[PDB]
Design an enzyme around this catalytic site. Structure first.
Site, mmCIF file in Angstrom:
data_model
loop_
_atom_site.group_PDB
_atom_site.id
_atom_site.type_symbol
_atom_site.label_atom_id
_atom_site.label_comp_id
_atom_site.label_asym_id
_atom_site.label_seq_id
_atom_site.Cartn_x
_atom_site.Cartn_y
_atom_site.Cartn_z
ATOM 1 N NE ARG A 141 -1.564 -1.663 4.349
ATOM 2 C CZ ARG A 141 -1.688 -2.293 4.915
ATOM 3 N NH1 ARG A 141 -2.585 -2.401 4.955
ATOM 4 N NH2 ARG A 141 -0.044 -2.229 5.804
ATOM 5 C CB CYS A 160 -6.120 10.130 -7.939
ATOM 6 S SG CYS A 160 -5.772 8.142 -8.792
ATOM 7 C CB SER A 181 -5.396 10.832 -19.984
ATOM 8 O OG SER A 181 -5.243 12.004 -18.847
#
Lengths: 276, 276
Positions: A141, A160, A181
């Site tokens: 994590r 996010c 992206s």
């Protein structure tokens, strides 16, 4: 063993050959492929792309400003729609609101202005990463996220833009960046250098050696106006990556300064001007 | 054009050959590789692995329970440390707390008990996805996250375990799942089937055709006790994937029922018993 920049070039070529026309928020069309991944070794090399000159001092200076948690545009040295949500007079003075590195250092804190004292407020994602690496290097994590600032006014609990995961084994620190992206022409080369640099920094203060940087994309795209310069970039042969040197022993992530870093052996091809 | 399960098998082989010993929270050692990706076509096929029988009715029934937002273990039909944070008497009655599909349907809501009415409370991540696909299919933020329930008591603002991104182009719905860790022997095959199924569902109610499922991992690992059965699994040749049929026209994601789905042409190799 093949040069890692070859992966980036193969991705560009894949998008030019198999990408499909997809429109983006800014009008401009793109050629798009969903889902890609590239792996860059950080072991005795630094993946600053060589098929065009990348402005590494800018990459460095922006990363330092992020690390500071600054929301003051003035503070970002020489090297969009979100502004519409701000007040005129605060905007004028350079106050960007709770964006960028504010999220890294004070995630969830309530923003007053760019000069307020936020010590102890919100989650310090970056120090949490460094602390976990020291308390449990096996942890799955060790994650830090960044948000596109334009999203924060638009909706409750926006996703996010980027999720950065660290990983430790055998004294090596690796980093995986997932980006929802990525603009292949401008953004990606910059992001590679930027997170690779962050990884070098964190490795230095935790006593580890840099391992791999893995870059994963959702909508991997090429703006229509970058097609011809990228086609030309694809004809250039990569040169061996340079090395990055950290010039003093630094103990806390906040102590790093732009002068602590030197690149050596960087032999890129000439600059490509890509127009945003 | 090579069978996609070949990717999963190549990943297993890569971990057996190049993975390094890494310990996990549960004691048990693993062989670990950081950063991998596989791509599965959903176009007229469903990636239910064929190199061992996968329990698809269980996958389906669990996904439906997720979709319901249930936190009642009783409600999960025939087909860990987190429990320690719960009260004895609520736990006994099957109340798991605000976990799993509660996050999908009521993200950020305050949990009372497993029988409370949460209509209108928290962010409905799943309906947000479906709604965005209808309002702006070009959007790069069509994202839904899941949390390992054990994390929610441990810390403020814990990272997600899984980030699922959807993408639309040319009337096709694709899905990318980023998972911070994946157990190759048990978890991964299940997760593939599960998100591929979700994608089929969402595509059906939005009028799109399934495109690709991209599976991306952080710490991709094989438990030491699964090594020998996986070595044997690697010797099996994949058979063509089966098809999935949705048997009626369904309009809302909450209306789907286990009987709406049929698999056909599924010819797996025998079951492999992997011991958790």
């Amino acid at each position: 063993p093949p040069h890692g920049e070859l992966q980036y070039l193969g991705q560009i070529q894949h998008i030019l050959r198999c990408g499909v026309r997809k429109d983006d928020r800014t009008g401009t069309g793109t050629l798009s492929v969903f889902g890609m991944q590239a792996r860059y070794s950080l072991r005795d090399e630094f993946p600053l792309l060589t098929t065009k000159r990348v402005f590494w001092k800018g990459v460095l200076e922006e990363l330092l400003w992020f690390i500071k948690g600054s929301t003051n545009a003035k503070e970002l040295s020489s090297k969009r729609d979100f502004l519409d949500s701000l007040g005129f007079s605060t905007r004028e003075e350079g106050d960007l609101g709770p964006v960028y590195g504010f999220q890294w250092r004070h995630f969830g804190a309530e923003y007053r202005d760019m000069e307020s004292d936020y010590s102890g407020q919100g989650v310090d994602q970056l120090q949490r990463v460094i602390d976990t690496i020291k308390t449990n290097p096996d942890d799955r994590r060790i994650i830090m996220c960044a948000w596109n600032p334009r999203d924060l006014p638009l909706m409750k609990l926006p996703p996010c833009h980027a999720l950065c995961q660290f990983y430790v084994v055998n004294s090596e620190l690796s980093c995986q960046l997932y980006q929802r992206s990525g603009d292949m022409g401008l953004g990606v080369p910059f992001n590679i250098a930027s997170y690779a640099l962050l990884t070098y920094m964190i490795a230095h203060i935790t006593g580890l050696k840099p391992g791999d940087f893995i870059h994963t994309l959702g909508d991997a795209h090429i703006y229509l106006n970058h097609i011809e310069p990228l086609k030309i970039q694809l004809q250039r042969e990569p040169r061996p990556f340079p090395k990055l040197r950290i010039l003093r022993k630094v103990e806390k992530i906040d102590d790093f300064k732009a002068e602590d870093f030197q690149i050596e052996g960087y032999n890129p091809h000439p600059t490509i001007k890509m127009e945003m």
